[PDB]
């Protein structure tokens, strides 16, 4: 019957000092986790070296927060082959802040997801609708077109490397609202890709999660874990991880 | 005065493996350089840690290739306070590839420069005009408009932290080639404006680096130009020939 393995993802965004991040990682390290869950830490590019070195908990992997597809004349950017050479195997793509501020269009996110999949990354691909879009009743068409763009560049086998993160930008929500969004995504994948892909697909909730609402949210049928913002910079991330049983 | 301290800056852009960049650092470490020059290695964010640990040459400092002013909810970006806490004190801002591909407008570069200066960084601020701006007779308009926007956010005293890099974008991948005389015309234009607008003291001390195609063979005749104070180098900076470029600044 089972839910696939849950994922607890820490998106630190553009935050942290060597000091403050190093303490948090010690805290994760000293954390006892007794179930099957993949914990993910996405730090800035700058802190990948210290994270890779200091995070030893065997249930954790490190991720990047963005990349471009190829090395070359792209001053300021980091590419997939550079990340792969550095030993980073997870990446967050298409986060709402990048779609909003940094020109991650539906198609550009799709190209990045496909390039990351093809060089072997595990990819957390973010989709989600704004406030205006939800109130207009355009959630399904906005959100499904986002994933459909990503799907156009994937084959069936690729979905084993893909995790979807639903970001309800419009609340920046009830378990019912989250559940219906996830069910909406899963139903799309079943109809458009196949039931053999959709049952296994992790769909993560990426709205504001804290230690107190996480449990009720994870109990939803189609919620497979979390992509956490601000609370991932704090000790309460550990309680979010624990909400995933 | 006579020429201020030159700078040889290596812009690795989006390149490098742990292995290839280490071998290159080892060489930089083993290089002897007999004159006063500031060398700068601007690596990708991922590589800043390993460059910090391994690069030991007293004439080399480490730079980042971009940043935003403030930490916060900006997934995938790197802020100035994150770089400063990491011990990075030079930064390249407004590079032509960012202006062209990633939203670096005149005012956004100016906001970044002001923030980085205020935060204590030495800033290499890039400017320069496309083929179309040049052909339409807009070289001076574009170059002065870009530097004026940056100036507008700075105080006279702040210029001690500022280095200008001129990029002849009109010569990049167009199959046109900038002569050393063309580089000189652009630098002299930049310096004369700084002299009238900011001050003759500031104009005299300002390093203006040439940021077009620089290699071992052309570096010496470029540096011989009166208002050329060194280089912001692309491709060759990933190569042993970057050492010859540093040496061409004697």
Curated annotation (Swiss-Prot), chain A:
Xref: Gene3D superfamilies: Aldolase class I
Pfam families: TIM
One GO cellular component term: cytosol
The reaction(s) this protein catalyses: D-glyceraldehyde 3-phosphate = dihydroxyacetone phosphate
Record has Zinc-finger as a keyword: no
Binding site residues for substrate: 11, 13
Any one GO MF annotation of this record: triose-phosphate isomerase activity
The EC number(s) this enzyme carries: 5.3.1.1
GO terms (BP aspect): gluconeogenesis; glyceraldehyde-3-phosphate biosynthetic process; glycerol catabolic process; glycolytic process
Active site: 95 (electrophile), 167 (proton acceptor)
Enzyme class: isomerase
Alphabetical keyword list: Gluconeogenesis, Glycolysis, Glycosome, Isomerase, Peroxisome
Keyword DNA-binding on entry: no
Family to which this protein belongs: Belongs to the triosephosphate isomerase family.
Quaternary data: Homodimer.
Note: The enzyme contains a high proportion of positively-charged residues in beta-barrels V and VII (compared to the homologous regions in other triose isomerase sequences). Since 2 clusters of positive charges located at precise distances on the molecular surface are common to 4 glycosomal enzymes, it has been speculated that this might represent a signal for entry into glycosomes.
Stated name of the protein: Triosephosphate isomerase, glycosomal
Organism: Trypanosoma brucei brucei
